[PDB]
Amino acid sequence: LQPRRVSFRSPGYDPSRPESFFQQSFQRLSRLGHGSYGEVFKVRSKEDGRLYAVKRSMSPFRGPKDRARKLAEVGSHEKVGQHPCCVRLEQAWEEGGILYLQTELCGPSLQQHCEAWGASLPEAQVWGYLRDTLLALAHLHSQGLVHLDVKPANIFLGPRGRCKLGDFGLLVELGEVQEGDPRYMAPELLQGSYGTAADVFSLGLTILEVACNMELPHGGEGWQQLRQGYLPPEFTAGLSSELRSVLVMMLEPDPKLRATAEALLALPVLRQ
Numbered sequence: 001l002q003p004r005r006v007s008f009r010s011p012g013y014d015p016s017r018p019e020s021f022f023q024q025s026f027q028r029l030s031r032l033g034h035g036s037y038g039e040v041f042k043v044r045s046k047e048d049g050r051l052y053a054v055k056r057s058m059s060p061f062r063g064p065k066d067r068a069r070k071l072a073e074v075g076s077h078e079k080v081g082q083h084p085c086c087v088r089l090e091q092a093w094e095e096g097g098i099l100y101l102q103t104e105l106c107g108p109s110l111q112q113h114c115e116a117w118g119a120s121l122p123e124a125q126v127w128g129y130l131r132d133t134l135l136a137l138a139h140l141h142s143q144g145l146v147h148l149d150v151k152p153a154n155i156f157l158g159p160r161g162r163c164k165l166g167d168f169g170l171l172v173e174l175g176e177v178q179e180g181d182p183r184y185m186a187p188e189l190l191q192g193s194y195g196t197a198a199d200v201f202s203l204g205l206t207i208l209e210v211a212c213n214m215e216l217p218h219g220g221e222g223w224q225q226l227r228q229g230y231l232p233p234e235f236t237a238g239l240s241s242e243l244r245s246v247l248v249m250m251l252e253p254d255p256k257l258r259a260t261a262e263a264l265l266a267l268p269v270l271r272q
């Protein structure tokens with residue numbers, strides 16, 4: 001069984017040894033995460049000795065559609081291309097029905113960071129993370145790409161207080177869609193209206209969660225409250241008027257009237 005490269009366009013590996021290309025070309029350092037998606041390892045390459053993060057799928061390909069669904073994340077990484085605020089894909093391959101993606105190594109997810117601090121984040125960090133993810137979203141939306149899964153778990157920290165948007169498994173190209181996280185779902189997604197506006201709403205709820213340390217409702221009464229155009233009165237009080245103002249713009253229920261990422265980045269408060 002041989003590793004096949006995956007794209008939409010190996011010195012330490014001896015093709016005669018039984019160990020996988022993953023186990024022969026890399027040094028596993030630590031397991032970053034495991035879920036139904038598979039595992040994510042912090043690895044150092046046995047070739048160049050740089051730090052990367054490798055994600056492998058859990059089970060072998062169940063069928064053609066399951067294979068196509070998994071390989072689409074690689075296509076999504078390529079359409080995004082090179083951007084400072086996007087997790088770069090280095091290479092992807094498949095071996096034995098398992099899909100392997102090798103990205104640059106980042107810091108903790110914004111979710112892990114907030115968990116560690118266990119309180120709200122100070123607004124200085126929030127504005128930086130808002131600006132970085134808005135820069136990512138503006139880069140995606142300028143190419144008719146919609147992320148559809150903006151949330152703390154899919155934003156990853158960078159050095160000196162930067163962060164990068166990641167996990168492009170749900171990304172779609174306007175011109176086919178999977179179930180997003182309902183906690184961060186834009187209201188128009190419920191009635192089949194998909195578009196770049198949806199990413200702006202998801203970021204606003206992302207920012208509302210990290211800046212207020214509040215957990216988002218999966219559904220029901222509270223879910224409706226966050227989607228009527230008023231921020232929740234208890235949690236909003238700590239925020240500044242400018243932040244409260246921008247969150248209201250991002251959380252506008254109507255996608256036709258919702259500020260775009262380009263419009264946001266052009267506001268005074270979101271300066272360089």
Ligand SMILES: CN(C)C(=O)c1ccc(-c2cnc3c(-c4ccc(F)c5[nH]ncc45)c(N)c(=O)[nH]c3c2)cc1
Nearest residue numbers: 032033034040053055087101103104105106107166167
């Ligand atoms: C309880 N628990 C275990 C968790 O909460 C949890 C779960 C997962 C992760 C995680 C996931 N992934 C990565 C990736 C990553 C890899 C491959 C890809 F194809 C990617 N696309 N976008 C990004 C990535 C990195 N690069 C990176 O630095 N750290 C990561 C950390 C962190 C914490």
